[PDB]
PDB file of C-alpha atoms in Angstrom:
ATOM      1  CA  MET V   1      37.037 146.166  33.011  1.00  0.00           C
ATOM      2  CA  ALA V   2      33.420 144.824  32.943  1.00  0.00           C
ATOM      3  CA  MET V   3      31.757 142.639  30.407  1.00  0.00           C
ATOM      4  CA  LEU V   4      28.175 143.559  29.597  1.00  0.00           C
ATOM      5  CA  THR V   5      26.580 140.661  28.080  1.00  0.00           C
ATOM      6  CA  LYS V   6      23.813 141.541  25.546  1.00  0.00           C
ATOM      7  CA  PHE V   7      23.015 138.202  24.108  1.00  0.00           C
ATOM      8  CA  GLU V   8      23.622 134.503  24.392  1.00  0.00           C
ATOM      9  CA  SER V   9      22.744 131.477  22.457  1.00  0.00           C
ATOM     10  CA  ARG V  10      23.300 128.046  23.981  1.00  0.00           C
ATOM     11  CA  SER V  11      24.022 125.240  21.535  1.00  0.00           C
ATOM     12  CA  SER V  12      26.521 122.555  20.712  1.00  0.00           C
ATOM     13  CA  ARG V  13      30.003 123.903  19.797  1.00  0.00           C
ATOM     14  CA  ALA V  14      30.096 127.113  17.770  1.00  0.00           C
ATOM     15  CA  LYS V  15      33.157 127.864  15.570  1.00  0.00           C
ATOM     16  CA  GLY V  16      32.514 131.143  13.786  1.00  0.00           C
ATOM     17  CA  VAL V  17      30.527 134.383  14.192  1.00  0.00           C
ATOM     18  CA  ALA V  18      29.823 137.241  11.952  1.00  0.00           C
ATOM     19  CA  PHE V  19      28.093 140.610  12.687  1.00  0.00           C
ATOM     20  CA  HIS V  20      25.887 142.219   9.951  1.00  0.00           C
ATOM     21  CA  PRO V  21      27.086 145.738   9.191  1.00  0.00           C
ATOM     22  CA  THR V  22      23.679 147.430   9.626  1.00  0.00           C
ATOM     23  CA  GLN V  23      21.135 144.893  10.970  1.00  0.00           C
ATOM     24  CA  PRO V  24      21.120 143.666  14.540  1.00  0.00           C
ATOM     25  CA  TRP V  25      22.051 140.197  13.355  1.00  0.00           C
ATOM     26  CA  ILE V  26      24.877 137.690  13.884  1.00  0.00           C
ATOM     27  CA  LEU V  27      25.486 134.565  11.779  1.00  0.00           C
ATOM     28  CA  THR V  28      26.777 131.637  13.874  1.00  0.00           C
ATOM     29  CA  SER V  29      28.493 128.879  12.101  1.00  0.00           C
ATOM     30  CA  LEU V  30      28.522 125.626  14.135  1.00  0.00           C
ATOM     31  CA  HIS V  31      30.479 122.410  14.547  1.00  0.00           C
ATOM     32  CA  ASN V  32      27.246 120.538  13.512  1.00  0.00           C
ATOM     33  CA  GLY V  33      27.407 121.972  10.054  1.00  0.00           C
ATOM     34  CA  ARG V  34      24.525 124.203  10.521  1.00  0.00           C
ATOM     35  CA  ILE V  35      24.517 128.115  10.422  1.00  0.00           C
ATOM     36  CA  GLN V  36      22.044 130.204  12.714  1.00  0.00           C
ATOM     37  CA  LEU V  37      20.999 133.744  12.121  1.00  0.00           C
ATOM     38  CA  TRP V  38      20.189 135.523  15.422  1.00  0.00           C
ATOM     39  CA  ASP V  39      18.659 138.899  16.213  1.00  0.00           C
ATOM     40  CA  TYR V  40      20.750 139.866  19.262  1.00  0.00           C
ATOM     41  CA  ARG V  41      18.474 142.706  20.311  1.00  0.00           C
ATOM     42  CA  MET V  42      15.348 140.480  20.422  1.00  0.00           C
ATOM     43  CA  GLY V  43      17.068 137.112  21.096  1.00  0.00           C
ATOM     44  CA  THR V  44      15.004 135.617  18.333  1.00  0.00           C
ATOM     45  CA  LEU V  45      16.094 132.971  15.853  1.00  0.00           C
ATOM     46  CA  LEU V  46      15.603 134.413  12.343  1.00  0.00           C
ATOM     47  CA  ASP V  47      16.819 131.555  10.162  1.00  0.00           C
ATOM     48  CA  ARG V  48      18.988 128.335  10.113  1.00  0.00           C
ATOM     49  CA  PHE V  49      20.866 127.387   7.067  1.00  0.00           C
ATOM     50  CA  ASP V  50      21.844 123.823   6.277  1.00  0.00           C
ATOM     51  CA  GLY V  51      24.443 123.596   3.223  1.00  0.00           C
ATOM     52  CA  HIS V  52      27.546 121.830   4.654  1.00  0.00           C
ATOM     53  CA  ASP V  53      28.474 118.476   5.891  1.00  0.00           C
ATOM     54  CA  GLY V  54      30.674 118.603   9.007  1.00  0.00           C
ATOM     55  CA  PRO V  55      31.879 121.688  10.925  1.00  0.00           C
ATOM     56  CA  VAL V  56      31.637 125.285   9.389  1.00  0.00           C
ATOM     57  CA  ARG V  57      34.544 127.413  10.598  1.00  0.00           C
ATOM     58  CA  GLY V  58      34.381 130.177   8.075  1.00  0.00           C
ATOM     59  CA  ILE V  59      31.353 132.705   8.002  1.00  0.00           C
ATOM     60  CA  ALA V  60      30.988 136.358   6.831  1.00  0.00           C
ATOM     61  CA  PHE V  61      28.387 138.831   5.559  1.00  0.00           C
ATOM     62  CA  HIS V  62      29.137 140.994   2.469  1.00  0.00           C
ATOM     63  CA  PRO V  63      29.238 144.521   3.701  1.00  0.00           C
ATOM     64  CA  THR V  64      26.588 145.956   1.291  1.00  0.00           C
ATOM     65  CA  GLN V  65      25.302 143.010  -0.905  1.00  0.00           C
ATOM     66  CA  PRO V  66      22.597 140.782   0.430  1.00  0.00           C
ATOM     67  CA  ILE V  67      25.114 137.900   0.537  1.00  0.00           C
ATOM     68  CA  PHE V  68      26.966 135.766   3.111  1.00  0.00           C
ATOM     69  CA  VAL V  69      29.729 133.250   2.695  1.00  0.00           C
ATOM     70  CA  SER V  70      30.457 130.064   4.638  1.00  0.00           C
ATOM     71  CA  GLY V  71      33.391 127.590   4.605  1.00  0.00           C
ATOM     72  CA  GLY V  72      33.402 124.167   5.794  1.00  0.00           C
ATOM     73  CA  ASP V  73      35.258 120.985   6.629  1.00  0.00           C
ATOM     74  CA  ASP V  74      33.738 119.653   3.299  1.00  0.00           C
ATOM     75  CA  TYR V  75      36.190 122.005   1.543  1.00  0.00           C
ATOM     76  CA  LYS V  76      33.459 124.117  -0.026  1.00  0.00           C
ATOM     77  CA  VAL V  77      33.113 127.922   0.074  1.00  0.00           C
ATOM     78  CA  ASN V  78      29.352 128.493  -0.115  1.00  0.00           C
ATOM     79  CA  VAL V  79      27.690 131.713  -1.134  1.00  0.00           C
ATOM     80  CA  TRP V  80      24.114 132.497   0.059  1.00  0.00           C
ATOM     81  CA  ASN V  81      21.663 135.202  -0.367  1.00  0.00           C
ATOM     82  CA  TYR V  82      20.148 135.886   3.165  1.00  0.00           C
ATOM     83  CA  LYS V  83      17.084 137.631   1.581  1.00  0.00           C
ATOM     84  CA  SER V  84      15.929 134.809  -0.509  1.00  0.00           C
ATOM     85  CA  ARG V  85      17.313 132.400   2.088  1.00  0.00           C
ATOM     86  CA  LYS V  86      19.134 130.328  -0.382  1.00  0.00           C
ATOM     87  CA  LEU V  87      22.349 128.737  -1.328  1.00  0.00           C
ATOM     88  CA  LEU V  88      23.384 130.415  -4.733  1.00  0.00           C
ATOM     89  CA  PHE V  89      26.395 128.199  -5.408  1.00  0.00           C
ATOM     90  CA  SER V  90      29.483 126.367  -3.899  1.00  0.00           C
ATOM     91  CA  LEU V  91      32.950 127.570  -4.944  1.00  0.00           C
ATOM     92  CA  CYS V  92      35.003 124.239  -5.164  1.00  0.00           C
ATOM     93  CA  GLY V  93      38.755 124.096  -5.397  1.00  0.00           C
ATOM     94  CA  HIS V  94      40.186 123.715  -1.833  1.00  0.00           C
ATOM     95  CA  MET V  95      41.232 120.256  -1.234  1.00  0.00           C
ATOM     96  CA  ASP V  96      41.043 120.131   2.609  1.00  0.00           C
ATOM     97  CA  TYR V  97      39.107 121.923   5.452  1.00  0.00           C
ATOM     98  CA  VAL V  98      38.250 125.904   4.770  1.00  0.00           C
ATOM     99  CA  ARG V  99      39.401 127.662   7.843  1.00  0.00           C
ATOM    100  CA  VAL V 100      38.183 131.185   7.099  1.00  0.00           C
ATOM    101  CA  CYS V 101      36.267 132.949   4.377  1.00  0.00           C
ATOM    102  CA  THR V 102      35.675 136.581   4.089  1.00  0.00           C
ATOM    103  CA  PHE V 103      34.500 139.226   1.554  1.00  0.00           C
ATOM    104  CA  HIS V 104      36.502 142.137   0.424  1.00  0.00           C
ATOM    105  CA  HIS V 105      35.135 145.570   1.330  1.00  0.00           C
ATOM    106  CA  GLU V 106      35.295 146.870  -2.193  1.00  0.00           C
ATOM    107  CA  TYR V 107      36.275 144.406  -4.959  1.00  0.00           C
ATOM    108  CA  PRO V 108      33.859 141.571  -5.775  1.00  0.00           C
ATOM    109  CA  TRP V 109      36.155 138.957  -4.191  1.00  0.00           C
ATOM    110  CA  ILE V 110      36.060 136.283  -1.507  1.00  0.00           C
ATOM    111  CA  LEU V 111      39.146 135.340   0.487  1.00  0.00           C
ATOM    112  CA  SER V 112      39.367 131.810   1.745  1.00  0.00           C
ATOM    113  CA  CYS V 113      42.157 129.752   3.435  1.00  0.00           C
ATOM    114  CA  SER V 114      42.541 126.120   3.961  1.00  0.00           C
ATOM    115  CA  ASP V 115      44.321 123.078   5.436  1.00  0.00           C
ATOM    116  CA  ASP V 116      45.538 122.398   1.916  1.00  0.00           C
ATOM    117  CA  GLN V 117      48.213 125.147   2.540  1.00  0.00           C
ATOM    118  CA  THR V 118      46.757 127.649   0.117  1.00  0.00           C
ATOM    119  CA  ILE V 119      44.857 130.872   0.379  1.00  0.00           C
ATOM    120  CA  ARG V 120      42.360 131.291  -2.532  1.00  0.00           C
ATOM    121  CA  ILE V 121      40.741 134.439  -3.903  1.00  0.00           C
ATOM    122  CA  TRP V 122      37.569 134.201  -5.818  1.00  0.00           C
ATOM    123  CA  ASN V 123      35.546 136.738  -7.881  1.00  0.00           C
ATOM    124  CA  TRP V 124      31.945 136.141  -6.729  1.00  0.00           C
ATOM    125  CA  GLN V 125      30.525 137.730  -9.836  1.00  0.00           C
ATOM    126  CA  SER V 126      32.369 135.532 -12.263  1.00  0.00           C
ATOM    127  CA  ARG V 127      32.387 132.594  -9.859  1.00  0.00           C
ATOM    128  CA  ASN V 128      36.194 132.053 -10.733  1.00  0.00           C
ATOM    129  CA  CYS V 129      39.064 131.348  -8.581  1.00  0.00           C
ATOM    130  CA  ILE V 130      41.359 134.283  -9.615  1.00  0.00           C
ATOM    131  CA  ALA V 131      44.272 133.431  -7.378  1.00  0.00           C
ATOM    132  CA  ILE V 132      45.834 130.769  -5.505  1.00  0.00           C
ATOM    133  CA  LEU V 133      48.426 131.896  -2.861  1.00  0.00           C
ATOM    134  CA  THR V 134      51.058 129.354  -2.259  1.00  0.00           C
ATOM    135  CA  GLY V 135      54.143 129.473   0.040  1.00  0.00           C
ATOM    136  CA  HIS V 136      52.848 128.204   3.509  1.00  0.00           C
ATOM    137  CA  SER V 137      54.054 124.638   4.282  1.00  0.00           C
ATOM    138  CA  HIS V 138      51.280 123.577   6.671  1.00  0.00           C
ATOM    139  CA  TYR V 139      47.589 124.379   7.233  1.00  0.00           C
ATOM    140  CA  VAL V 140      46.691 127.923   6.698  1.00  0.00           C
ATOM    141  CA  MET V 141      44.611 128.882   9.736  1.00  0.00           C
ATOM    142  CA  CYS V 142      43.728 132.399   8.991  1.00  0.00           C
ATOM    143  CA  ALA V 143      43.698 134.921   6.245  1.00  0.00           C
ATOM    144  CA  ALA V 144      42.552 138.659   6.174  1.00  0.00           C
ATOM    145  CA  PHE V 145      42.210 141.413   3.679  1.00  0.00           C
ATOM    146  CA  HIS V 146      43.759 144.668   4.778  1.00  0.00           C
ATOM    147  CA  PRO V 147      41.098 147.314   5.297  1.00  0.00           C
ATOM    148  CA  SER V 148      42.705 150.026   2.998  1.00  0.00           C
ATOM    149  CA  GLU V 149      45.680 148.478   1.306  1.00  0.00           C
ATOM    150  CA  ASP V 150      46.088 145.851  -1.224  1.00  0.00           C
ATOM    151  CA  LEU V 151      47.494 143.345   1.299  1.00  0.00           C
ATOM    152  CA  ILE V 152      46.496 140.035   2.783  1.00  0.00           C
ATOM    153  CA  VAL V 153      47.802 138.713   6.078  1.00  0.00           C
ATOM    154  CA  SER V 154      47.772 135.038   6.862  1.00  0.00           C
ATOM    155  CA  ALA V 155      48.730 132.635   9.710  1.00  0.00           C
ATOM    156  CA  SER V 156      49.948 128.927   9.400  1.00  0.00           C
ATOM    157  CA  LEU V 157      50.755 126.007  11.488  1.00  0.00           C
ATOM    158  CA  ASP V 158      54.175 126.334   9.713  1.00  0.00           C
ATOM    159  CA  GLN V 159      54.736 128.864  12.520  1.00  0.00           C
ATOM    160  CA  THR V 160      54.752 131.837  10.244  1.00  0.00           C
ATOM    161  CA  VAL V 161      52.548 134.838   9.536  1.00  0.00           C
ATOM    162  CA  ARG V 162      52.888 135.982   5.870  1.00  0.00           C
ATOM    163  CA  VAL V 163      51.944 139.417   4.301  1.00  0.00           C
ATOM    164  CA  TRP V 164      51.065 139.161   0.545  1.00  0.00           C
ATOM    165  CA  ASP V 165      50.965 142.076  -1.944  1.00  0.00           C
ATOM    166  CA  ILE V 166      47.862 141.658  -4.123  1.00  0.00           C
ATOM    167  CA  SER V 167      48.078 145.076  -5.859  1.00  0.00           C
ATOM    168  CA  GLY V 168      48.882 143.095  -9.121  1.00  0.00           C
ATOM    169  CA  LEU V 169      45.836 140.813  -8.837  1.00  0.00           C
ATOM    170  CA  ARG V 170      43.667 143.889  -8.381  1.00  0.00           C
ATOM    171  CA  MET V 171      44.977 145.680 -11.444  1.00  0.00           C
ATOM    172  CA  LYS V 172      44.696 142.650 -13.622  1.00  0.00           C
ATOM    173  CA  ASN V 173      41.159 141.451 -12.394  1.00  0.00           C
ATOM    174  CA  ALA V 174      39.725 144.971 -12.660  1.00  0.00           C
ATOM    175  CA  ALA V 175      41.128 145.829 -16.236  1.00  0.00           C
ATOM    176  CA  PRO V 176      38.331 145.705 -18.804  1.00  0.00           C
ATOM    177  CA  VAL V 177      39.191 143.633 -21.901  1.00  0.00           C
ATOM    178  CA  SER V 178      37.307 142.961 -25.190  1.00  0.00           C
ATOM    179  CA  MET V 179      37.353 139.409 -26.346  1.00  0.00           C
ATOM    180  CA  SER V 180      36.775 137.934 -29.844  1.00  0.00           C
ATOM    181  CA  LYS V 181      35.097 134.771 -29.168  1.00  0.00           C
ATOM    182  CA  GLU V 182      36.943 132.998 -32.018  1.00  0.00           C
ATOM    183  CA  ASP V 183      40.289 134.176 -31.079  1.00  0.00           C
ATOM    184  CA  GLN V 184      40.668 132.779 -27.638  1.00  0.00           C
ATOM    185  CA  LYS V 185      43.337 130.471 -26.366  1.00  0.00           C
ATOM    186  CA  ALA V 186      42.268 126.843 -26.773  1.00  0.00           C
ATOM    187  CA  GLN V 187      42.360 126.121 -23.040  1.00  0.00           C
ATOM    188  CA  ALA V 188      44.910 128.713 -21.746  1.00  0.00           C
ATOM    189  CA  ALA V 189      53.092 138.115  -9.698  1.00  0.00           C
ATOM    190  CA  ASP V 190      49.404 138.907  -8.946  1.00  0.00           C
ATOM    191  CA  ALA V 191      50.034 137.861  -5.267  1.00  0.00           C
ATOM    192  CA  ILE V 192      53.557 137.922  -3.983  1.00  0.00           C
ATOM    193  CA  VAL V 193      54.761 137.332  -0.580  1.00  0.00           C
ATOM    194  CA  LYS V 194      55.926 140.617   0.895  1.00  0.00           C
ATOM    195  CA  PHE V 195      56.925 139.456   4.486  1.00  0.00           C
ATOM    196  CA  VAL V 196      57.419 136.306   6.245  1.00  0.00           C
ATOM    197  CA  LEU V 197      57.060 136.870  10.054  1.00  0.00           C
ATOM    198  CA  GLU V 198      59.141 134.475  11.975  1.00  0.00           C
ATOM    199  CA  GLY V 199      59.127 134.217  15.899  1.00  0.00           C
ATOM    200  CA  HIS V 200      56.222 131.981  16.991  1.00  0.00           C
ATOM    201  CA  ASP V 201      57.488 128.639  18.276  1.00  0.00           C
ATOM    202  CA  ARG V 202      54.476 126.715  17.398  1.00  0.00           C
ATOM    203  CA  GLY V 203      51.564 126.891  14.996  1.00  0.00           C
ATOM    204  CA  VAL V 204      49.853 130.147  14.357  1.00  0.00           C
ATOM    205  CA  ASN V 205      46.029 130.035  14.541  1.00  0.00           C
ATOM    206  CA  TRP V 206      45.082 133.606  13.845  1.00  0.00           C
ATOM    207  CA  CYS V 207      46.068 136.863  12.479  1.00  0.00           C
ATOM    208  CA  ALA V 208      44.621 140.369  12.318  1.00  0.00           C
ATOM    209  CA  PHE V 209      45.143 143.716  10.902  1.00  0.00           C
ATOM    210  CA  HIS V 210      44.546 147.026  12.960  1.00  0.00           C
ATOM    211  CA  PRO V 211      41.921 148.989  11.113  1.00  0.00           C
ATOM    212  CA  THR V 212      43.921 152.243  10.998  1.00  0.00           C
ATOM    213  CA  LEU V 213      47.427 151.561  12.269  1.00  0.00           C
ATOM    214  CA  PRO V 214      50.124 149.563  10.382  1.00  0.00           C
ATOM    215  CA  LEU V 215      50.030 146.712  13.025  1.00  0.00           C
ATOM    216  CA  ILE V 216      49.523 142.953  12.986  1.00  0.00           C
ATOM    217  CA  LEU V 217      48.249 140.681  15.647  1.00  0.00           C
ATOM    218  CA  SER V 218      48.970 137.042  15.713  1.00  0.00           C
ATOM    219  CA  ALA V 219      48.138 134.180  18.116  1.00  0.00           C
ATOM    220  CA  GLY V 220      48.850 130.429  18.406  1.00  0.00           C
ATOM    221  CA  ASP V 221      49.542 127.258  20.103  1.00  0.00           C
ATOM    222  CA  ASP V 222      52.634 128.822  21.979  1.00  0.00           C
ATOM    223  CA  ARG V 223      49.765 130.493  24.129  1.00  0.00           C
ATOM    224  CA  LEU V 224      51.343 133.858  22.988  1.00  0.00           C
ATOM    225  CA  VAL V 225      49.692 136.801  21.272  1.00  0.00           C
ATOM    226  CA  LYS V 226      52.325 138.781  19.127  1.00  0.00           C
ATOM    227  CA  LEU V 227      52.143 142.323  17.985  1.00  0.00           C
ATOM    228  CA  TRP V 228      53.921 143.173  14.717  1.00  0.00           C
ATOM    229  CA  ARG V 229      54.667 146.330  12.855  1.00  0.00           C
ATOM    230  CA  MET V 230      55.103 147.051   9.273  1.00  0.00           C
ATOM    231  CA  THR V 231      56.186 149.857   6.827  1.00  0.00           C
ATOM    232  CA  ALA V 232      56.312 149.620   2.951  1.00  0.00           C
ATOM    233  CA  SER V 233      59.644 148.095   3.221  1.00  0.00           C
ATOM    234  CA  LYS V 234      59.989 146.031   6.631  1.00  0.00           C
ATOM    235  CA  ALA V 235      58.021 144.211   9.158  1.00  0.00           C
ATOM    236  CA  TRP V 236      59.182 143.349  12.544  1.00  0.00           C
ATOM    237  CA  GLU V 237      57.909 141.901  15.980  1.00  0.00           C
ATOM    238  CA  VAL V 238      57.159 144.692  18.504  1.00  0.00           C
ATOM    239  CA  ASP V 239      56.111 142.698  21.683  1.00  0.00           C
ATOM    240  CA  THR V 240      54.427 139.645  23.132  1.00  0.00           C
ATOM    241  CA  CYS V 241      51.199 139.327  25.389  1.00  0.00           C
ATOM    242  CA  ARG V 242      52.025 136.628  27.948  1.00  0.00           C
ATOM    243  CA  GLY V 243      49.376 134.953  30.011  1.00  0.00           C
ATOM    244  CA  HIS V 244      47.182 132.394  28.301  1.00  0.00           C
ATOM    245  CA  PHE V 245      47.758 128.889  29.506  1.00  0.00           C
ATOM    246  CA  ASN V 246      46.516 127.084  26.492  1.00  0.00           C
ATOM    247  CA  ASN V 247      46.166 127.512  22.702  1.00  0.00           C
ATOM    248  CA  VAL V 248      45.157 131.006  21.680  1.00  0.00           C
ATOM    249  CA  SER V 249      42.436 130.486  18.933  1.00  0.00           C
ATOM    250  CA  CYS V 250      41.854 134.057  17.894  1.00  0.00           C
ATOM    251  CA  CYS V 251      42.855 137.639  18.423  1.00  0.00           C
ATOM    252  CA  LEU V 252      41.812 141.188  17.235  1.00  0.00           C
ATOM    253  CA  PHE V 253      42.415 144.817  17.828  1.00  0.00           C
ATOM    254  CA  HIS V 254      39.768 147.014  19.572  1.00  0.00           C
ATOM    255  CA  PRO V 255      39.064 149.379  16.844  1.00  0.00           C
ATOM    256  CA  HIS V 256      38.346 152.492  18.979  1.00  0.00           C
ATOM    257  CA  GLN V 257      40.453 151.875  22.123  1.00  0.00           C
ATOM    258  CA  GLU V 258      44.093 151.172  22.720  1.00  0.00           C
ATOM    259  CA  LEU V 259      43.392 147.473  23.401  1.00  0.00           C
ATOM    260  CA  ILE V 260      44.097 144.110  22.233  1.00  0.00           C
ATOM    261  CA  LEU V 261      41.576 141.137  22.649  1.00  0.00           C
ATOM    262  CA  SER V 262      42.396 137.442  22.549  1.00  0.00           C
ATOM    263  CA  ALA V 263      40.437 134.173  23.033  1.00  0.00           C
ATOM    264  CA  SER V 264      41.658 130.819  24.039  1.00  0.00           C
ATOM    265  CA  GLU V 265      41.201 127.081  24.763  1.00  0.00           C
ATOM    266  CA  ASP V 266      42.193 127.987  28.245  1.00  0.00           C
ATOM    267  CA  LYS V 267      38.409 129.140  28.584  1.00  0.00           C
ATOM    268  CA  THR V 268      39.264 132.826  28.779  1.00  0.00           C
ATOM    269  CA  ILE V 269      38.816 136.139  26.716  1.00  0.00           C
ATOM    270  CA  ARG V 270      41.645 138.465  27.605  1.00  0.00           C
ATOM    271  CA  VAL V 271      42.009 142.229  27.165  1.00  0.00           C
ATOM    272  CA  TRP V 272      45.510 143.750  26.971  1.00  0.00           C
ATOM    273  CA  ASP V 273      46.945 147.236  26.679  1.00  0.00           C
ATOM    274  CA  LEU V 274      48.038 148.082  23.033  1.00  0.00           C
ATOM    275  CA  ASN V 275      50.975 150.229  24.270  1.00  0.00           C
ATOM    276  CA  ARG V 276      52.402 148.254  27.305  1.00  0.00           C
ATOM    277  CA  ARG V 277      51.000 144.757  26.146  1.00  0.00           C
ATOM    278  CA  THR V 278      50.150 144.186  29.874  1.00  0.00           C
ATOM    279  CA  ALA V 279      46.995 142.385  30.957  1.00  0.00           C
ATOM    280  CA  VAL V 280      44.079 144.692  31.564  1.00  0.00           C
ATOM    281  CA  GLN V 281      41.252 142.004  32.173  1.00  0.00           C
ATOM    282  CA  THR V 282      40.639 138.333  32.090  1.00  0.00           C
ATOM    283  CA  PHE V 283      37.114 136.979  31.501  1.00  0.00           C
ATOM    284  CA  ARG V 284      36.462 133.224  32.134  1.00  0.00           C
ATOM    285  CA  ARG V 285      33.856 130.556  31.296  1.00  0.00           C
ATOM    286  CA  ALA V 286      33.730 127.475  33.599  1.00  0.00           C
ATOM    287  CA  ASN V 287      33.658 124.720  31.008  1.00  0.00           C
ATOM    288  CA  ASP V 288      33.783 126.330  27.531  1.00  0.00           C
ATOM    289  CA  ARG V 289      36.894 126.863  25.415  1.00  0.00           C
ATOM    290  CA  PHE V 290      36.783 129.796  23.157  1.00  0.00           C
ATOM    291  CA  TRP V 291      37.300 129.376  19.391  1.00  0.00           C
ATOM    292  CA  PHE V 292      36.616 132.760  17.881  1.00  0.00           C
ATOM    293  CA  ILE V 293      36.056 136.491  18.633  1.00  0.00           C
ATOM    294  CA  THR V 294      34.965 139.335  16.395  1.00  0.00           C
ATOM    295  CA  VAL V 295      34.008 142.842  16.707  1.00  0.00           C
ATOM    296  CA  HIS V 296      31.144 144.869  15.037  1.00  0.00           C
ATOM    297  CA  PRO V 297      32.269 147.016  11.955  1.00  0.00           C
ATOM    298  CA  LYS V 298      31.076 150.255  13.765  1.00  0.00           C
ATOM    299  CA  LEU V 299      29.624 149.530  17.353  1.00  0.00           C
ATOM    300  CA  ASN V 300      31.789 148.619  20.401  1.00  0.00           C
ATOM    301  CA  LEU V 301      30.064 145.254  20.439  1.00  0.00           C
ATOM    302  CA  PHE V 302      31.883 141.914  20.477  1.00  0.00           C
ATOM    303  CA  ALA V 303      30.925 138.319  19.895  1.00  0.00           C
ATOM    304  CA  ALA V 304      32.648 135.089  20.904  1.00  0.00           C
ATOM    305  CA  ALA V 305      32.065 131.489  19.807  1.00  0.00           C
ATOM    306  CA  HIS V 306      32.711 128.779  22.375  1.00  0.00           C
ATOM    307  CA  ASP V 307      32.014 125.218  23.232  1.00  0.00           C
ATOM    308  CA  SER V 308      28.349 125.866  24.343  1.00  0.00           C
ATOM    309  CA  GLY V 309      27.331 128.474  21.863  1.00  0.00           C
ATOM    310  CA  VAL V 310      27.806 132.227  21.267  1.00  0.00           C
ATOM    311  CA  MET V 311      27.795 135.502  23.315  1.00  0.00           C
ATOM    312  CA  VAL V 312      27.453 139.073  22.207  1.00  0.00           C
ATOM    313  CA  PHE V 313      28.843 141.606  24.713  1.00  0.00           C
ATOM    314  CA  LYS V 314      30.034 145.141  25.346  1.00  0.00           C
ATOM    315  CA  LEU V 315      33.220 146.115  27.319  1.00  0.00           C
ATOM    316  CA  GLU V 316      33.098 148.413  30.399  1.00  0.00           C
TER     317      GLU V 316
END
């Protein structure tokens, strides 16, 4: 397989990247605390955003609203409007580095996870934290909403991947209620762990759902990428991709081909077969560790963050 590079930015270490759903943009979140907005069709720098102190690992666009969210080592989950170019507010509550932040595709929610061993769900309209998911016993390195089901998957340095049922939280946060102002409490099961996936012998750095199949991918400091399957009642390990020679920082499913992608501190991006879990192709940079990979929500277009910036590319 061949990599067709479409855009590269050279910079100090990049940690996160996010594709805009409809515009030819990527947000890049940097170790230096800044966030860049690039047009990858023209190679132009559209804006730069400075609202964090220290590295910013979390970064995502809302799918339809003119918003993006960022999460930093300063513990804040920041919500911005990219049209007015301004920081709207900070969501505070995490007590250690924020590792990932994303928006839900339908509900007015933001998902964040943190080294404080928690996953938080926020309602970005009310600006409240509506759930704190506890149960991991070390840093939560990744969390993700399922694309069609009321599930979250999370990965932790406790060596586990957890699947959480948030159907209760959805029912409760959506239910309309009338409120008598004078009759409120004077300072008065939503998310339940469904599966705990055990198998990695070291910390887990990343987890991903497949967009249409009941599969989970996870990757970690054991240099392995694992494939898991789930039903309504069970979840189990299917197989392992073996080949990386250093920590695997990120992994994802190719949304339109039977392929798995992973990215590693071994300075490679690897492609594997979804059915055989054998190697298909290895792409290497000489001096740059990879920290993150993502795929466009519709196009076969990928982006990777590494020690010297970001790249946007197609595959053969």
